[PDB]
Design a protein around this nucleic acid. Structure first.
Ligand SMILES: Nc1ncnc2c1ncn2[C@H]1C[C@H](O)[C@@H](CO[P@](O)(=S)OP(=O)(O)OP(=O)(O)O)O1
Ligand SMILES: [Ca+2]
Length: 427
DNA sequence: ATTATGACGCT
DNA sequence: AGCGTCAT
């Protein structure tokens, strides 16, 4: 009771851009706005692989990982934008630069953790304290906010439902104590409305957001009312929310571990985890995972928002599927050079922008016949930002992977090359 | 023949 | 270090 931690100490938000590469292309090309459209990379094999889909196109069943030719079967009027090709490969610079636009705006409000190209966590605990001292919260301050779990108790069109939930929530708020976690989340949501308004004003991009007491709940919250809306998941909302929430929906449980939780414990939903002792969960899933699961199923998580706005690595990779697999030494060296020249370009820009230098080069390849995504990974020193040097260095660290007796040929053929700059130091 | 990324845990 | 897992 009196000593029972409730994980209500922080206000954390997760901001997730909607259909982000699509929005980047729609900003650039007005003709794509408010249309079923997708972003595709390459075009020769089956029309290209889809990596992003507008919500209009999702209504037809178009998804990521679909070939454009097949998506066209579902949606004949589907519009497509192609990822830039440079030096023979897809080049994601446009989307990395758009990401920086959003991340810099978010950083005006609080220190962010860059989670992916279009997602960032923010710890709003301090900003909420400040806003609290400056002030009753009007519904007008929360025009795109859902309160998860509401309305409840004794019209039915979506905006009506949203407002009815929001009204129940605000009506229940004890606003006179500056210590109420629910009030803190609410003020957090007011700030996120402001952040999201600024992102849209200043970039043209819309996004969704979750507000809760930790990163995992904020992330879960965010997805509950995509797109262009934000969702508040209170501590009190967790038992009902988790009672029907498949374990795989929770960040880090969407893979083998999550499947093992389901299989070993014979459960389906996050809420069912509460019936196990911490020691029981540790016994099955290890010390760290077990403690993490015990707290998480009660809505409690302690992973901090890390103050990191920049990626920790800068990498360049290309697959050579089917019989495009690299079988000659000339081929291997040409493509290592292409990758190295892109890497050099991005590295030089990074050093100018961000006052840092990578010190380690990681070289990864895949060989035809291997089932793993990476067959072999070797590091060497990265001492100069020089593409010819990096490509030569990469070749020497992998050249003995060639089982071919003659060194004019490469065997078994390479189906992936990967160069990654790591271990940055200030400069 | 999804591809091109990127963070973090394990030993 | 090199490899595996999990995620955009
Ligand atoms: N598997 C994969 N390969 C390549 N690029 C990807 C992949 N997944 C996502 N992305 C890119 C393209 C996306 O626009 C961008 C962000 O991914 P996410 O957030 S999973 O999806 P979005 O396109 O932003 O739609 P959504 O967030 O509104 O659901 O990363
Ligand atoms: Ca997104």
């Amino acid at each position: 009771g009196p000593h029972m931690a409730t994980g209500q100490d922080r206000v954390v938000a997760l901001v997730d851009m909607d259909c982000f590469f699509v929005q980047v292309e729609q900003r650039q090309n007005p003709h794509l706005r408010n249309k079923p459209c997708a972003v595709v990379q390459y075009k020769s094999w089956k029309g290209g692989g889809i990596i992003a889909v507008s919500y209009e196109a999702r209504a037809f069943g178009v998804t990521r990982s679909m070939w454009a030719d097949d998506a066209k079967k579902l949606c004949p009027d589907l519009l497509l934008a192609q990822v830039r090709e440079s030096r023979g490969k897809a080049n994601l610079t446009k989307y990395r630069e758009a990401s920086v636009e959003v991340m810099e705006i978010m950083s005006r409000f609080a220190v962010i953790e860059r989670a992916s190209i279009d997602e960032a966590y923010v710890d709003l605990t301090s900003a909420v304290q400040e806003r609290l001292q400056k002030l009753p919260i009007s519904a007008d301050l929360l025009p795109s906010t859902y309160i998860e779990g509401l309305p409840q108790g004794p019209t039915v069109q979506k905006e009506g439902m949203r407002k009815q939930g929001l009204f129940q929530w605000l009506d229940s708020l004890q606003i006179d104590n500056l210590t109420s976690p629910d009030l803190q989340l609410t003020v957090g949501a007011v700030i996120v409305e402001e952040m999201r308004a600024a992102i849209e004003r200043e970039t043209g991009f819309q996004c969704s957001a979750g507000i809760s007491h930790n990163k995992v709940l904020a992330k879960l919250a965010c997805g509950l009312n995509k797109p262009n809306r934000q969702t508040l998941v209170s501590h009190g909302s967790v038992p009902q929310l988790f009672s029907q929430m498949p374990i795989r929906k929770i960040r880090s449980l969407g893979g083998k571990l999550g499947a093992s939780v389901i299989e070993i414990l014979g459960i389906e939903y996050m809420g069912e985890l509460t019936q196990f002792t911490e020691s029981q969960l540790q016994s099955h899933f290890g010390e760290k995972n077990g403690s993490w699961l015990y707290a998480m199923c009660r809505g409690i998580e302690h992973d901090p928002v890390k103050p990191r706005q920049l990626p920790k690595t800068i990498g360049c990779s290309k697959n050579f599927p089917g019989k495009t697999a690299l079988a000659t030494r000339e081929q291997v060296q040409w493509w290592l050079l292409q990758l190295a020249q892109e890497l050099e370009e991005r590295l030089t820009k990074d050093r100018n922008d961000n006052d840092r230098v990578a010190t380690q080069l990681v070289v990864s390849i895949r060989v035809q016949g291997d089932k793993r995504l990476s067959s072999l990974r070797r590091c060497c020193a990265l001492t100069r930002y020089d593409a010819h040097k990096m490509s030569h260095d990469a070749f020497t660290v992998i050249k003995n992977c060639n089982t071919s007796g003659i060194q004019t040929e490469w065997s078994p053929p390479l189906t992936m090359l990967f160069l990654c700059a790591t271990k940055f130091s200030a400069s």
